[PDB]
């Protein structure tokens, strides 16, 4: 009983300090910048070959090779320049929700509803792609696999927890807990020592991979958070929920900086990504199109459109040369 | 394509495309169905020709040169709003109800879901003998206090069927009903008729006749 009141006064103190630190909104301080105008992107490539809905996609570190999983049980690796299928990996379970591409390009992990994170080896001496490891230990559907290195991978599940694995041993090295709902998405910081996870309890909290501690937590969303992406310099992140709103939280200030809501937007955000500079906040909605938000004034600086069904995944290359979108109509489109 | 290695890469890509097309052609013969219902309702014991293969459970029995894949979503124990859209393309929903309120709640939730507004439902009422033996011992009034009709088996079963169909509340959807016992073998035939009827209706809608 006393612990409940202690928690209540702790939350009150945290909120009071958080409001005390706030002096001016981002939209007020940066009001003097020239607008970026209208950013028109044209479809340069259209990657076809998938025969079912696409849930995930990841870009190679070299910004030329892709990876995508769909309901057909196929894991296809594309050549984003000449539109060629380098590999075609058949999954054991057709229910897959999260691709991941290794930073070194050697491995590609691909897990989903079947509760395990299958890890595939691309550079084999036999010339084929083999499942190097199959990581088990989660009691719920998997989401947003991310590679730290060639032998370290972070996973998120519907078990209201995130886990850090060791591919060599295959055991759950560290487990992060504290969420009260299904954890839907995570993104790894460029410094590669912290990561943030967006759960179904309308809250995203920052984690530490080394200590396994919840350093920070962020609130403000009215519904389940569906995607998260870090700011390029590793000091902010943008979240997307079914509330049809995007928000920009800052790790140093511990508060949301601005909101990216438009009156004409009804459906929520499925995927969130930034640009290389950190000025365009691209977000995918359920109304079949993506809106490019100028991340400093919250004005729609163009619309991608072009897709027939819901956009399920976004991807911005490391050099920023392209933006690739995947949707449920089994078509990937590359924009520039 | 000018180089030799790029020509070989293009040939490899074309071979992969051909393999993908063949696999997709071979992946259209099957029929994808969804199993649902309360626990201990016989949702895993419909057809004796089971041939299965924590997570998702697949059953791939075949009939009349047609492959039926039953995805039993049981055991997930998570929020259905986040993965139920993975089954948007299922031909039908097989709902199993044991007659011997929660089942009505699931049925209401699954029938009015935004993903399955046009997906027909095949409703199975299991354990006729158990229900008929239990109704004599206890009248159908403890769970349905609004009942007024006769306590006979036929009228009670029809009343339960009526309350299960009353939650439809949607056009472009049909509920196919069937009464099953433990010692029944023709469930495959009933599923085949329901699936072919659903396919006929979908083709009718696509052709523009209706």
């Amino acid at each position, epitope marked *: 009983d006393q612990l409940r009141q202690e928690a209540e006064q702790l939350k009150n103190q945290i909120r009071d300090a958080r409001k005390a630190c706030a002096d001016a909104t981002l939209s007020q301080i940066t009001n003097n910048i020239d607008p970026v105008g209208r950013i028109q992107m044209r479809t340069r490539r259209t990657l076809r070959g998938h025969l079912a809905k696409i849930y995930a996609m990841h870009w190679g570190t070299d910004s*030329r*090779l892709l990876v995508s999983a769909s309901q057909d049980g196929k894991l296809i690796i594309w*050549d984003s320049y000449t539109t*060629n299928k*380098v*590999h075609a990996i058949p999954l054991r379970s057709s229910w897959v929700m999260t691709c991941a591409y290794a930073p070194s*390009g050697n491995y590609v992990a691909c897990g989903g509803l079947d509760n395990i994170c299958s890890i595939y080896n691309l*550079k084999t*001496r*036999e*010339g*084929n792609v083999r499942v190097s490891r199959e990581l088990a230990g989660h009691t719920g559907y998997l989401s947003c696999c991310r590679f730290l290195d060639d032998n370290q991978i972070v996973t998120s599940s519907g078990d209201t927890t995130c886990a850090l694995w060791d591919i060599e041993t295959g055991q759950q090295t560290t487990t992060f807990t504290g969420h009260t709902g299904d954890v839907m998405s995570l993104s790894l910081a460029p410094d590669t020592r912290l990561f943030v996870s967006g759960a179904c309890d309308a809250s995203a909290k920052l984690w530490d991979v080394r200590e396994g501690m919840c350093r920070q937590t962020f609130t403000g969303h009215e519904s389940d958070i569906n995607a998260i992406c870090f700011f390029p310099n590793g000091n902010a992140f943008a979240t997307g929920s079914d509330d049809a709103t995007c928000r920009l939280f800052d790790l140093r200030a511990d508060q949301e900086l601005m909101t990216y809501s438009h009156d004409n937007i009804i459906c929520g955000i499925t995927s969130v990504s930034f640009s290389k500079s950190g000025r365009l906040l691209l977000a995918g909605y359920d109304d079949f199109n993506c809106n490019v938000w100028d991340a400093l004034k919250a004005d729609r600086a163009g619309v991608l459109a072009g897709h027939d069904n819901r956009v399920s995944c976004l991807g911005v290359t490391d050099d920023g040369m392209a933006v690739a979108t995947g949707s449920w109509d089994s078509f990937l489109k590359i924009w520039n | 394509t*000018l*180089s*030799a*290695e*790029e*020509r*070989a*890469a293009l*040939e*490899r890509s074309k*071979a992969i495309e051909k393999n993908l097309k063949e696999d997709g052609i071979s992946a259209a013969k099957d029929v994808k169905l969804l199993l649902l219902g309360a626990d201990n309702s016989g949702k895993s014991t419909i057809v004796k020709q089971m041939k299965i293969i924590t997570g998702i459970v697949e059953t791939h029995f075949t009939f009349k040169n047609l492959h039926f894949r039953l995805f039993d979503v049981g055991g997930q124990r998570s929020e259905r709003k986040k993965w139920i859209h993975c089954f948007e393309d299922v031909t039908a929903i097989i709902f199993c109800v044991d007659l011997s309120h929660e089942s009505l709640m699931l049925f209401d939730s699954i029938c009015n879901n935004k993903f399955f507004i046009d997906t027909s439902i095949i409703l199975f009422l299991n354990k006729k003998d158990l229900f008929g033996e239990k109704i004599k011992k206890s009248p159908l009034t403890i769970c349905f206090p609004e009942y007024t009709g006769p306590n006979t088996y036929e009228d009670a079963a029809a009343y339960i069927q009526a309350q299960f169909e009353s939650k439809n509340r949607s056009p472009n959807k049909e509920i196919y009903c069937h009464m099953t016992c433990a010692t029944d073998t023709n469930n495959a035939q009933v599923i085949f008729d329901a699936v072919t009827d659903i396919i006929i209706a979908n083709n009718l809608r696509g052709c523009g006749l209706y």
Partner: single-chain antibody
Amino acid sequence: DVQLVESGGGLVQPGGSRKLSCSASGFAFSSFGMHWVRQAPEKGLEWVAYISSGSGTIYYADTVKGRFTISRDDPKNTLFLQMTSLRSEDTAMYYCVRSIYYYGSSPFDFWGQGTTLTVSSSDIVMTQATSSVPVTPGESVSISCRSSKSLLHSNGNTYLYWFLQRPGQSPQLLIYRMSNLASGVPDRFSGSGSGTAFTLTISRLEAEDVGVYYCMQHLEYPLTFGAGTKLEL
């Protein structure tokens, strides 16, 4: 273990027909384009034939065009080579080489053990400046070979391959485009080049590194090898 072993060699009379079988075991045979490379006695390597994956595209050398026949048996994991008429110039040690082509692959990594065949009695020209170089261990060595055309394609990839043949063994790939190190070779190797002049350097040479170094172009068929530079100790 990847292993290519071939049989069918021996002494044959001129005008006869002989078939060589290259049996593969240890990799996905159906996904690898396979070549045939012959090495005349103390003369050097020379390309012969190539069959793509699935027997789609097949090429032949101008010397034996219309005279040899190459066939692929994917279920049996066997590669054949049928020759109709044999002259006295066909006597050589025939090698079987696998080649997989995609973005970032190593298309000459593994070579067969070699089979010896004896017979009783426009193109891109690659030239190697020196035929024999004596050197002591621990001293860096520079090997260079030129090409007639500029192998630097429009896509930025230069198709130059450097092979190493230890005495009594089969050639092994070291660098496949300009500096892309092969799988398992020591990191002391390094390669460079610009358009038509290319150089291979070996820092801290070891005693197991002596042999004959071949540079081959893959820009356009027929593939042509260099004269061959031999390291002496």
